[PDB]
Write a protein that binds this ligand. Structure first.
Ligand code: NA
Lengths: 216, 216
C-alpha cells in the first residue's frame, strides 16, 4: 500500500539552504497530513513540521514544509544551515487505514570539508579463488564525501541483481568514506560473459569500471 | 604508560557462562581498583562492578569480578547469560598519576543464530591498476556472525599500519555480515616484498590469506 521514500543523504555548506523530499507510492501524498521529525543522536525526536506546513512555536522559521501534488511529494526546506542541524530527518503520514507510515530517513550533512567523488577499483577473481571453484568480483569504493552511493552491476551489458552485496559506507581515517560491493558467481558464469561492470553513483557523479577474464 | 586490553568481541548462547578478561600492560593490575561498565545498544552506561568485585545492589548477582595477579588481569564473569545482557563492556582503572585508563571495550552477543566464522578473500592489484601506476590490495570479509572483526596486514612478515583502511561490518541479505579492508601501496613496494598477508580475527578465531607478486 502507501509508502514514503526519502533520499538517503543531503548536503550543504553552513548558511545555505537545502531541501529533503518525501515521495509517496500507491496513493496521493495529499490524502493525509505529513509530519517532519528531527532525530539527534540519542534523545527524543523533535517535531519540526506538522500538518504539512504548520510549525511549532519553539521551532525557528528556518524550517518550512510544503506539498507538491505534481510529484506526489512532501518537502522540508531548511535555510540558514547551522552545524547543529546535522541529524537524521523523517517524514511521516498515514496509509489507507490511518495507520502510521514513515520514511527511511535522510542523513543531513553540513559540509565541513570539500566534497569528493569516489575512487572505483574493480577486481577480477583471484587465481587462488578460481582454483577453489569459486569466483567473486569486488568493487572497491573509497575516498568519497558525503557518504551516500548507489551501486549497480552489469554482465555483458544487461544488469544483474542476484548475488550482489554492498556494504554500508563507513569512515576512513581521513574523514572520508569507504565501501565495497561484491558479486559472487560460479566460474562458468565468469567465463560465459565477455565483461562485467560496476557502476557507482555519488550525487551527480557516475563512475563505471569494467573487467574481463584474464588473457594471461 | 598503563594500558588495558580486552578482547574485541565475545558471544555465547542464552543461559551459559562467559568471562571477559582485561589485561594490563606496563604496570600491575593490582595497583588500583578496577571498574566494569555496561553499555546496552543505544542506552546510557551503567556500573556493573566497582573496586575489583563490589556489586551495586541493583545489579544481579549473575555478575562478578575477580583479579588474577599471575596474568596481570581483571575479569568479569556472567553466570547464566540472559538476552538483556547483549551490550558493550568496558574495564576501567587508573595510572600511576591516578588518571582514568579505559579498556578498548568488548562487544557481547547473546546468540540468536548460529555462529559463523568469516570467509576471507584476498585480491592482488589488477592490471588496470598497475597500468595506472597504482596498487591496492583488497581483503573481502563475508558471511560472519556476530558482526565484529579486526583486521591486520603484514608485508612479508612484518606488520604494516600505513595505508590500511577497514570498513565497518554491514549486514548482508542473508542476515550475516560483510566487511572489507584495503592496503594502498606504490607499484614499487608491491614488487619489492615477496608476499602480503591479511589477517582477520573473529572471536579468538583468525583467518589469514596470503598473496605474492606474480606477473599478471
Ligand atoms: Na547481535
Amino acid at each position: 500500500n502507501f509508502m514514503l521514500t526519502q533520499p538517503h543523504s543531503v548536503s550543504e555548506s553552513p548558511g545555505k539552504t537545502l531541501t529533503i523530499s518525501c515521495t509517496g507510492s500507491s496513493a496521493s501524498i495529499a490524502s493525509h497530513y505529513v509530519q517532519w521529525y528531527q532525530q539527534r543522536p540519542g534523545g527524543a525526536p523533535t517535531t519540526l513540521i506538522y500538518e504539512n506546513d504548520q510549525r511549532p512555536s519553539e521551532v525557528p522559521d528556518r524550517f518550512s514544509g510544503s506539498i507538491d501534488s505534481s510529484s506526489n511529494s512532501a518537502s522540508l526546506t531548511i535555510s540558514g544551515l547551522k552545524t547543529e542541524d546535522e541529524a537524521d530527518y523523517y517524514c511521516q503520514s498515514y496509509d489507507g487505514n490511518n495507520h502510521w507510515v514513515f520514511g527511511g530517513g535522510t542523513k543531513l550533512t553540513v559540509l565541513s570539508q570539500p566534497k569528493a567523488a569516489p575512487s572505483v577499483t574493480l577486481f577480477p577473481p583471484s587465481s587462488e579463488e578460481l582454483q577453489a571453484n569459486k569466483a567473486t568480483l569486488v568493487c572497491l569504493i573509497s575516498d568519497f564525501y558525503p557518504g551516500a552511493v548507489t551501486v549497480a552491476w552489469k554482465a555483458d551489458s544487461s544488469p544483474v541483481k542476484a548475488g550482489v552485496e554492498t556494504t554500508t559506507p563507513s569512515k576512513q581515517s581521513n574523514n572520508k568514506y569507504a565501501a565495497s560491493s561484491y558479486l559472487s558467481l560460479t566460474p562458468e558464469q565468469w567465463k560465459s560473459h565477455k565483461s562485467y561492470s560496476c557502476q557507482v553513483t555519488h550525487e551527480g557523479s557516475t563512475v563505471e569500471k569494467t573487467v574481463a577474464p584474464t588473457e594471461c
